[PDB]
Amino acid sequence: TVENFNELPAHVWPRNAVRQEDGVVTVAGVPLPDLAEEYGTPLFVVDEDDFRSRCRDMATAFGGPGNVHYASKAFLTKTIARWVDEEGLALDIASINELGIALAAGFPASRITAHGNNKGVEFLRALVQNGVGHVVLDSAQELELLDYVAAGEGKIQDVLIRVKPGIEAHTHEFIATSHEDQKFGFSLASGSAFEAAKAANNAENLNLVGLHCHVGSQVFDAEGFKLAAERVLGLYSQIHSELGVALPELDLGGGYGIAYTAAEEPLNVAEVASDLLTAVGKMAAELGIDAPTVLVEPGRAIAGPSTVTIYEVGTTKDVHVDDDKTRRYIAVDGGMSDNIRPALYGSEYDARVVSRFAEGDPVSTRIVGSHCESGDILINDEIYPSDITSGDFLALAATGAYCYAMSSRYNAFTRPAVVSVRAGSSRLMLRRETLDDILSLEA
Amino acid sequence: TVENFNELPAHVWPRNAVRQEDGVVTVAGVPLPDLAEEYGTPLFVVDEDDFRSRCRDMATAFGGPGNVHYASKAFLTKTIARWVDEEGLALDIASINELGIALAAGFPASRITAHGNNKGVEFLRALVQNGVGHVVLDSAQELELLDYVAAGEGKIQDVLIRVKPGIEAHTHEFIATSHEDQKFGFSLASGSAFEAAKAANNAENLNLVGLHCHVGSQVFDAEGFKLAAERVLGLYSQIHSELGVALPELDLGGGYGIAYTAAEEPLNVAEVASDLLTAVGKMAAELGIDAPTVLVEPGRAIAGPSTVTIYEVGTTKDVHVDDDKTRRYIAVDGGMSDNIRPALYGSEYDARVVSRFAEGDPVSTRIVGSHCESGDILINDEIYPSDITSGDFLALAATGAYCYAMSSRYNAFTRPAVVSVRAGSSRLMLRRETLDDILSLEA
Ligand SMILES: *Cc1c(COP(=O)(O)O)cnc(C)c1O
Ligand SMILES: *Cc1c(COP(=O)(O)O)cnc(C)c1O
């Protein structure tokens, strides 16, 4: 109905977003239509306090800022690095260039944890040389090469070992196997995780501080994580009783969910954190071991909800699908270049006109981008007002995670600008790419 | 078997690729390992004569190089535009920046055909002011707006109108429907393509020269194209007999296929073009109309096979999939950021070691990239020798189309270098990105 489309689901949109009485949406007091006209569309707009409030919600819930690592895979700039730094969080990195961005923004290396399934020797040297907090080991080969690079330098390197406990946790279900057929870490079940722990114990230039796992995607309760944790704590016990070693940390990954659409419930960190910590505690007690410090690695659940993407509506048409059955197609000025996720995973997004109220009769609508392929589809099948039209600004919610980071130059489109908002003003974070940027790779 | 892996299927790999007798693969006389060591991995290597010789195969098959548009969306630089220029081909463009690249290469505007489902007023003006040969009209709104823009300037702009005939042509089949539920153009069966040709004729500042359709993907015979052509020419006949207009041109789009893996047959363009042009002549004559000049718009089939992507192998491990059964994971230093197509579309690629012969026992193997998510998978499930190892150079064939254009900076990976080779020497086309490219969007 027209009513529902003119609302703004608070649990999806950014915390400081508001539908004004004229139909305009503001984020931190700044009208979205004014940002679009000042910076051009498409536009990524980041609610800065929203980002920070999700850092603090995470921090409270897992017992302090330094047990929460921000997964920079979701979105990383110098600005974001500094926000994360200021809130006292840890930072997850996964390539030499992400490390580069972090160091360039002043981010202390001792609060950096380093992931990667295929870390080269250049990347390792840089990590050890800058005295990074943790290196998370993927393979026997990384383990041996990290030892040589550590010995080659002064240093001893705090490491975690990635373990596959055989749990894959989703929104409505988790799936349990003996082994995970995937490229990361060591199997728990073949003993291979235990032999990696042994080898890192023995290594003179590595200090083993705990195990890591990552089992979740868009998770809203703790039950998959509890079963992951039980299994991994079986291994903390085997390590304790077979090697005598106590492990201070347990790193349980991210995969914490956010609501993308009005029907989905928002995440409740505090409940999820309360259930999981408690369970760890009872489990460590039952096994006769020290309850390790739980570390977590939210990407999506910190960066995601803070950000929207504004497009300008261009072409509209009624496309025949049978003899008098039509579907309304709305073209916007970006597409799969700035949001690849509906195409790649089937992900559904909430869209709203943020320039006005709609009055049109609701009809079956598809939002498409401006690229010359079918499949460049942002919203597949919804019932939206039929007076959405050329010159309206339309935004999608929850584009702060993965979208910008997965953006392409398909059809030579320029990566969009990222602007941040706070206390009624807007700061440019990332300028819009230009045709000159593209052409400069040819000089 | 190991013997099959050590071959180089000629029909897949660039035309000037050879397996030397030490196992090293050369393209246009340049050993691929020397390029890897010279310009870093990952590397796109383009066999320039291959690219040219496919321009020539198309040109001979469709009756002169002016009838063939190269579909820029596959891959476009100033260098590619210059080659298309020199070979005598038209160039189909889909955005204002693909136009900009072409014009900065000095590519003649009168040989440019412009596409787009949501052409803005800036873009239309650039096109009209530079005097592009054709604008392909996608909606009633672009038509009226292109008429206005053309009035504003001196001119009468030549146009084609995109038509959806209800045909979707694939490798082993075609699918025929009365309407096409997709974003582009006007239905044949509703009457809306007729109304559109009626309005383009009428327009004072538009000259209607033909229809356009694009029906195919990875097509190897003319059956689907033929039926698409039958249906569209039925509209040529209706136009002549209800408006008295004769249309000189007919653009049948691209969608011509290339062999990606060894089991596939290569395209026979000579035979496919003969069968289609012959049928078009027979249908035109049966309908009592002039036989239009047939235009075609290959992308994949000009650019795909000319190019390979070289990687360095990093990490290797046997990954347990249940208690007794393993799968060999080989990681390489790029991934979904330089080739999104296995993940996005499920596309298979052929992979070979290009630095030496392999001797090892053949085992179930999966090739993965270096990004932190499962599903960053280049080759899902093949059987390759078990001595493939760290420091080997591995290459995928047929990466000349859609791969570089769809690359992203996920995990802040830099876009790879693109090198062309000809007559035993190598030329840099696109420099590798750096961290300073990534940081510069903050400054
Ligand atoms: C994927 C991943 C994350 C975060 O995933 P979200 O769904 O964004 O929480 C964190 N750490 C590692 C190592 C990962 O691979
Ligand atoms: C995709 C497309 C083509 C060519 O596709 P290939 O499969 O690379 O031949 C040509 N014209 C238009 C308008 C397109 O959208």
Side-chain angles (χ1 to χ4, degrees), chain B residues 328-342:
Chain B
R328 195 150 182 276
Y329 278 71
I330 299 159
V332 302
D333 56 335
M336 61 189 291
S337 52
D338 62 86
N339 185 4
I340 195 58
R341 302 193 74 251

mmCIF file with all atom_site columns, all heavy atoms in Angstrom, chain B residues 328-342:
data_model
loop_
_atom_site.group_PDB
_atom_site.id
_atom_site.type_symbol
_atom_site.label_atom_id
_atom_site.label_alt_id
_atom_site.label_comp_id
_atom_site.label_asym_id
_atom_site.label_entity_id
_atom_site.label_seq_id
_atom_site.pdbx_PDB_ins_code
_atom_site.Cartn_x
_atom_site.Cartn_y
_atom_site.Cartn_z
_atom_site.occupancy
_atom_site.B_iso_or_equiv
_atom_site.pdbx_formal_charge
_atom_site.auth_seq_id
_atom_site.auth_comp_id
_atom_site.auth_asym_id
_atom_site.auth_atom_id
_atom_site.pdbx_PDB_model_num
ATOM 1   N N   . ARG B 1 328 ? 41.977 -31.147 -3.041  1.00 0.00 ? 328 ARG B N   1
ATOM 2   C CA  . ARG B 1 328 ? 43.194 -30.405 -3.084  1.00 0.00 ? 328 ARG B CA  1
ATOM 3   C C   . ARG B 1 328 ? 42.806 -28.985 -3.421  1.00 0.00 ? 328 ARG B C   1
ATOM 4   O O   . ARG B 1 328 ? 42.207 -28.728 -4.446  1.00 0.00 ? 328 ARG B O   1
ATOM 5   C CB  . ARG B 1 328 ? 44.191 -31.000 -4.099  1.00 0.00 ? 328 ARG B CB  1
ATOM 6   C CG  . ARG B 1 328 ? 45.615 -30.476 -3.917  1.00 0.00 ? 328 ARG B CG  1
ATOM 7   C CD  . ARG B 1 328 ? 46.690 -31.494 -4.349  1.00 0.00 ? 328 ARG B CD  1
ATOM 8   N NE  . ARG B 1 328 ? 48.029 -30.948 -4.094  1.00 0.00 ? 328 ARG B NE  1
ATOM 9   C CZ  . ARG B 1 328 ? 48.743 -30.121 -4.902  1.00 0.00 ? 328 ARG B CZ  1
ATOM 10  N NH1 . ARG B 1 328 ? 48.340 -29.725 -6.126  1.00 0.00 ? 328 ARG B NH1 1
ATOM 11  N NH2 . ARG B 1 328 ? 49.926 -29.685 -4.473  1.00 0.00 ? 328 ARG B NH2 1
ATOM 12  N N   . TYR B 1 329 ? 43.132 -28.067 -2.531  1.00 0.00 ? 329 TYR B N   1
ATOM 13  C CA  . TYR B 1 329 ? 42.900 -26.648 -2.752  1.00 0.00 ? 329 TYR B CA  1
ATOM 14  C C   . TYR B 1 329 ? 44.244 -26.007 -3.143  1.00 0.00 ? 329 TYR B C   1
ATOM 15  O O   . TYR B 1 329 ? 45.277 -26.178 -2.444  1.00 0.00 ? 329 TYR B O   1
ATOM 16  C CB  . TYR B 1 329 ? 42.349 -26.031 -1.473  1.00 0.00 ? 329 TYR B CB  1
ATOM 17  C CG  . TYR B 1 329 ? 40.854 -26.241 -1.293  1.00 0.00 ? 329 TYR B CG  1
ATOM 18  C CD1 . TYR B 1 329 ? 40.294 -27.518 -0.982  1.00 0.00 ? 329 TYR B CD1 1
ATOM 19  C CD2 . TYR B 1 329 ? 39.984 -25.159 -1.430  1.00 0.00 ? 329 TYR B CD2 1
ATOM 20  C CE1 . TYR B 1 329 ? 38.912 -27.663 -0.799  1.00 0.00 ? 329 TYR B CE1 1
ATOM 21  C CE2 . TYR B 1 329 ? 38.636 -25.308 -1.271  1.00 0.00 ? 329 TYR B CE2 1
ATOM 22  C CZ  . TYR B 1 329 ? 38.087 -26.530 -0.955  1.00 0.00 ? 329 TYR B CZ  1
ATOM 23  O OH  . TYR B 1 329 ? 36.709 -26.518 -0.858  1.00 0.00 ? 329 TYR B OH  1
ATOM 24  N N   . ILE B 1 330 ? 44.222 -25.292 -4.262  1.00 0.00 ? 330 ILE B N   1
ATOM 25  C CA  . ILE B 1 330 ? 45.372 -24.502 -4.729  1.00 0.00 ? 330 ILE B CA  1
ATOM 26  C C   . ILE B 1 330 ? 44.926 -23.076 -4.744  1.00 0.00 ? 330 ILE B C   1
ATOM 27  O O   . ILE B 1 330 ? 43.966 -22.750 -5.417  1.00 0.00 ? 330 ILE B O   1
ATOM 28  C CB  . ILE B 1 330 ? 45.793 -24.844 -6.163  1.00 0.00 ? 330 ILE B CB  1
ATOM 29  C CG1 . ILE B 1 330 ? 46.216 -26.304 -6.247  1.00 0.00 ? 330 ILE B CG1 1
ATOM 30  C CG2 . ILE B 1 330 ? 46.938 -23.935 -6.640  1.00 0.00 ? 330 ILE B CG2 1
ATOM 31  C CD1 . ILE B 1 330 ? 46.137 -26.815 -7.676  1.00 0.00 ? 330 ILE B CD1 1
ATOM 32  N N   . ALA B 1 331 ? 45.624 -22.240 -3.994  1.00 0.00 ? 331 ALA B N   1
ATOM 33  C CA  . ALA B 1 331 ? 45.319 -20.822 -3.921  1.00 0.00 ? 331 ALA B CA  1
ATOM 34  C C   . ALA B 1 331 ? 46.241 -20.081 -4.890  1.00 0.00 ? 331 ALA B C   1
ATOM 35  O O   . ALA B 1 331 ? 47.390 -20.508 -5.103  1.00 0.00 ? 331 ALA B O   1
ATOM 36  C CB  . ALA B 1 331 ? 45.502 -20.298 -2.492  1.00 0.00 ? 331 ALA B CB  1
ATOM 37  N N   . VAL B 1 332 ? 45.727 -18.990 -5.457  1.00 0.00 ? 332 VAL B N   1
ATOM 38  C CA  . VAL B 1 332 ? 46.466 -18.149 -6.370  1.00 0.00 ? 332 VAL B CA  1
ATOM 39  C C   . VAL B 1 332 ? 46.238 -16.704 -5.943  1.00 0.00 ? 332 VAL B C   1
ATOM 40  O O   . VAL B 1 332 ? 45.271 -16.398 -5.263  1.00 0.00 ? 332 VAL B O   1
ATOM 41  C CB  . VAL B 1 332 ? 46.015 -18.328 -7.852  1.00 0.00 ? 332 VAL B CB  1
ATOM 42  C CG1 . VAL B 1 332 ? 46.158 -19.768 -8.327  1.00 0.00 ? 332 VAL B CG1 1
ATOM 43  C CG2 . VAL B 1 332 ? 44.577 -17.817 -8.109  1.00 0.00 ? 332 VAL B CG2 1
ATOM 44  N N   . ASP B 1 333 ? 47.104 -15.813 -6.387  1.00 0.00 ? 333 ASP B N   1
ATOM 45  C CA  . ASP B 1 333 ? 47.178 -14.475 -5.806  1.00 0.00 ? 333 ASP B CA  1
ATOM 46  C C   . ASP B 1 333 ? 46.146 -13.444 -6.285  1.00 0.00 ? 333 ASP B C   1
ATOM 47  O O   . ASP B 1 333 ? 46.194 -12.270 -5.887  1.00 0.00 ? 333 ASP B O   1
ATOM 48  C CB  . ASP B 1 333 ? 48.594 -13.890 -5.943  1.00 0.00 ? 333 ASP B CB  1
ATOM 49  C CG  . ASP B 1 333 ? 49.108 -13.849 -7.393  1.00 0.00 ? 333 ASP B CG  1
ATOM 50  O OD1 . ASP B 1 333 ? 48.659 -14.637 -8.261  1.00 0.00 ? 333 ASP B OD1 1
ATOM 51  O OD2 . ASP B 1 333 ? 50.031 -13.050 -7.634  1.00 0.00 ? 333 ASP B OD2 1
ATOM 52  N N   . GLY B 1 334 ? 45.225 -13.835 -7.133  1.00 0.00 ? 334 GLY B N   1
ATOM 53  C CA  . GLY B 1 334 ? 44.123 -12.943 -7.444  1.00 0.00 ? 334 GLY B CA  1
ATOM 54  C C   . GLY B 1 334 ? 42.849 -13.472 -6.830  1.00 0.00 ? 334 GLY B C   1
ATOM 55  O O   . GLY B 1 334 ? 42.847 -13.984 -5.704  1.00 0.00 ? 334 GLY B O   1
ATOM 56  N N   . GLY B 1 335 ? 41.775 -13.345 -7.596  1.00 0.00 ? 335 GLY B N   1
ATOM 57  C CA  . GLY B 1 335 ? 40.528 -14.037 -7.321  1.00 0.00 ? 335 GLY B CA  1
ATOM 58  C C   . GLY B 1 335 ? 39.341 -13.357 -7.980  1.00 0.00 ? 335 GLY B C   1
ATOM 59  O O   . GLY B 1 335 ? 39.440 -12.848 -9.119  1.00 0.00 ? 335 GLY B O   1
ATOM 60  N N   . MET B 1 336 ? 38.225 -13.368 -7.239  1.00 0.00 ? 336 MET B N   1
ATOM 61  C CA  . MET B 1 336 ? 36.942 -12.835 -7.678  1.00 0.00 ? 336 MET B CA  1
ATOM 62  C C   . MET B 1 336 ? 36.991 -11.351 -8.020  1.00 0.00 ? 336 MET B C   1
ATOM 63  O O   . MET B 1 336 ? 36.189 -10.873 -8.831  1.00 0.00 ? 336 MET B O   1
ATOM 64  C CB  . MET B 1 336 ? 35.814 -13.166 -6.663  1.00 0.00 ? 336 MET B CB  1
ATOM 65  C CG  . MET B 1 336 ? 35.933 -12.640 -5.222  1.00 0.00 ? 336 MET B CG  1
ATOM 66  S SD  . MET B 1 336 ? 34.657 -13.338 -4.118  1.00 0.00 ? 336 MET B SD  1
ATOM 67  C CE  . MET B 1 336 ? 33.187 -12.545 -4.759  1.00 0.00 ? 336 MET B CE  1
ATOM 68  N N   . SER B 1 337 ? 37.941 -10.642 -7.411  1.00 0.00 ? 337 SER B N   1
ATOM 69  C CA  . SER B 1 337 ? 38.234 -9.260  -7.747  1.00 0.00 ? 337 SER B CA  1
ATOM 70  C C   . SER B 1 337 ? 38.738 -9.067  -9.174  1.00 0.00 ? 337 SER B C   1
ATOM 71  O O   . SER B 1 337 ? 38.544 -7.987  -9.681  1.00 0.00 ? 337 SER B O   1
ATOM 72  C CB  . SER B 1 337 ? 39.296 -8.677  -6.815  1.00 0.00 ? 337 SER B CB  1
ATOM 73  O OG  . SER B 1 337 ? 40.419 -9.545  -6.782  1.00 0.00 ? 337 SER B OG  1
ATOM 74  N N   . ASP B 1 338 ? 39.445 -10.038 -9.778  1.00 0.00 ? 338 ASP B N   1
ATOM 75  C CA  . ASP B 1 338 ? 39.876 -9.920  -11.190 1.00 0.00 ? 338 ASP B CA  1
ATOM 76  C C   . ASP B 1 338 ? 39.100 -10.843 -12.126 1.00 0.00 ? 338 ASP B C   1
ATOM 77  O O   . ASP B 1 338 ? 39.208 -10.741 -13.374 1.00 0.00 ? 338 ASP B O   1
ATOM 78  C CB  . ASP B 1 338 ? 41.395 -10.108 -11.358 1.00 0.00 ? 338 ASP B CB  1
ATOM 79  C CG  . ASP B 1 338 ? 41.883 -11.487 -10.933 1.00 0.00 ? 338 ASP B CG  1
ATOM 80  O OD1 . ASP B 1 338 ? 41.841 -12.422 -11.763 1.00 0.00 ? 338 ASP B OD1 1
ATOM 81  O OD2 . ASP B 1 338 ? 42.341 -11.631 -9.772  1.00 0.00 ? 338 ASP B OD2 1
ATOM 82  N N   . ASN B 1 339 ? 38.299 -11.735 -11.546 1.00 0.00 ? 339 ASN B N   1
ATOM 83  C CA  . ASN B 1 339 ? 37.425 -12.578 -12.337 1.00 0.00 ? 339 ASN B CA  1
ATOM 84  C C   . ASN B 1 339 ? 36.230 -13.067 -11.495 1.00 0.00 ? 339 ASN B C   1
ATOM 85  O O   . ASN B 1 339 ? 36.283 -14.097 -10.841 1.00 0.00 ? 339 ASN B O   1
ATOM 86  C CB  . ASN B 1 339 ? 38.237 -13.718 -12.921 1.00 0.00 ? 339 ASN B CB  1
ATOM 87  C CG  . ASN B 1 339 ? 37.438 -14.564 -13.859 1.00 0.00 ? 339 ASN B CG  1
ATOM 88  O OD1 . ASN B 1 339 ? 36.264 -14.262 -14.139 1.00 0.00 ? 339 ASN B OD1 1
ATOM 89  N ND2 . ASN B 1 339 ? 38.058 -15.645 -14.355 1.00 0.00 ? 339 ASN B ND2 1
ATOM 90  N N   . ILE B 1 340 ? 35.159 -12.291 -11.546 1.00 0.00 ? 340 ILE B N   1
ATOM 91  C CA  . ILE B 1 340 ? 33.955 -12.497 -10.746 1.00 0.00 ? 340 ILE B CA  1
ATOM 92  C C   . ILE B 1 340 ? 33.016 -13.600 -11.337 1.00 0.00 ? 340 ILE B C   1
ATOM 93  O O   . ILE B 1 340 ? 32.013 -13.974 -10.710 1.00 0.00 ? 340 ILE B O   1
ATOM 94  C CB  . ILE B 1 340 ? 33.194 -11.147 -10.683 1.00 0.00 ? 340 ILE B CB  1
ATOM 95  C CG1 . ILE B 1 340 ? 32.106 -11.076 -9.587  1.00 0.00 ? 340 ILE B CG1 1
ATOM 96  C CG2 . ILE B 1 340 ? 32.562 -10.864 -12.045 1.00 0.00 ? 340 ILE B CG2 1
ATOM 97  C CD1 . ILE B 1 340 ? 32.599 -11.327 -8.179  1.00 0.00 ? 340 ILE B CD1 1
ATOM 98  N N   . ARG B 1 341 ? 33.361 -14.114 -12.515 1.00 0.00 ? 341 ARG B N   1
ATOM 99  C CA  . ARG B 1 341 ? 32.431 -14.852 -13.362 1.00 0.00 ? 341 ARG B CA  1
ATOM 100 C C   . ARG B 1 341 ? 32.117 -16.299 -12.922 1.00 0.00 ? 341 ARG B C   1
ATOM 101 O O   . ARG B 1 341 ? 30.978 -16.740 -13.017 1.00 0.00 ? 341 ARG B O   1
ATOM 102 C CB  . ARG B 1 341 ? 32.912 -14.807 -14.825 1.00 0.00 ? 341 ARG B CB  1
ATOM 103 C CG  . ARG B 1 341 ? 33.047 -13.381 -15.355 1.00 0.00 ? 341 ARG B CG  1
ATOM 104 C CD  . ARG B 1 341 ? 33.208 -13.348 -16.871 1.00 0.00 ? 341 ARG B CD  1
ATOM 105 N NE  . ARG B 1 341 ? 31.939 -13.644 -17.537 1.00 0.00 ? 341 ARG B NE  1
ATOM 106 C CZ  . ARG B 1 341 ? 31.624 -14.760 -18.201 1.00 0.00 ? 341 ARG B CZ  1
ATOM 107 N NH1 . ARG B 1 341 ? 32.477 -15.777 -18.378 1.00 0.00 ? 341 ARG B NH1 1
ATOM 108 N NH2 . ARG B 1 341 ? 30.388 -14.843 -18.704 1.00 0.00 ? 341 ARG B NH2 1
ATOM 109 N N   . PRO B 1 342 ? 33.111 -17.038 -12.419 1.00 0.00 ? 342 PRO B N   1
ATOM 110 C CA  . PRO B 1 342 ? 32.710 -18.296 -11.778 1.00 0.00 ? 342 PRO B CA  1
ATOM 111 C C   . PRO B 1 342 ? 31.650 -18.111 -10.643 1.00 0.00 ? 342 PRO B C   1
ATOM 112 O O   . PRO B 1 342 ? 30.651 -18.837 -10.623 1.00 0.00 ? 342 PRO B O   1
ATOM 113 C CB  . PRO B 1 342 ? 34.029 -18.842 -11.237 1.00 0.00 ? 342 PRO B CB  1
ATOM 114 C CG  . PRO B 1 342 ? 35.072 -18.230 -12.111 1.00 0.00 ? 342 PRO B CG  1
ATOM 115 C CD  . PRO B 1 342 ? 34.570 -16.869 -12.468 1.00 0.00 ? 342 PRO B CD  1
#
